[PDB]
Amino acid sequence: SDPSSINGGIVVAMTGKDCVAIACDLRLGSQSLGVSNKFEKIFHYGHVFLGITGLATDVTTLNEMFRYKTNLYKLKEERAIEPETFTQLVSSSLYERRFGPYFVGPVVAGINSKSGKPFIAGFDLIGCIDEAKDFIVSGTASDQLFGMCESLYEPNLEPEDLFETISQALLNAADRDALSGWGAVVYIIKKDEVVKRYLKMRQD
């Protein structure tokens, strides 16, 4: 009965040279029982990408909630929301439920369409913003991801190189966690093209 570790799952985001990458596993379980190997944890609202780990009901709820909010934002502002702004919206929305929070570990990733600057950010379940140059980690194998990312990561990686680094960071971290794995997805994000790759990983 620890909400953050019932369903399980992981998300990791990295910055490269004029690019960002965000990756997640596909597992959804009920503790020991694996239930779904198709449960994607990365969503997008225009060019801003959001990965959410934690309690799956809240992952689904928050996706639906941010889709709702970014749609009204776009209608009123007459432009797509930027990563820096969206990050603040996520923080606001989470802290609004300070004493009854969503049991989630969200991760924002995207490129500012105006400045062209790669941007990533992480949050705790209560909305504290964790901005980073290099990488953000979230989920039941966050310790593993921290250890992988801290050793494998180097700055200004090309998209093709960055893909390998993030992919290896997720896979090897997921294989040391019981509640993570069962398939993986990696988003490589350039200024005006986005490639989505499904990784082959061990299915145990």
Binding site: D124, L125, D130
Partner: peptide, 4 residues
């Protein structure tokens, strides 16, 4: 959660 994060907590100097």
């Amino acid at each position: 959660x994060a907590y100097x």
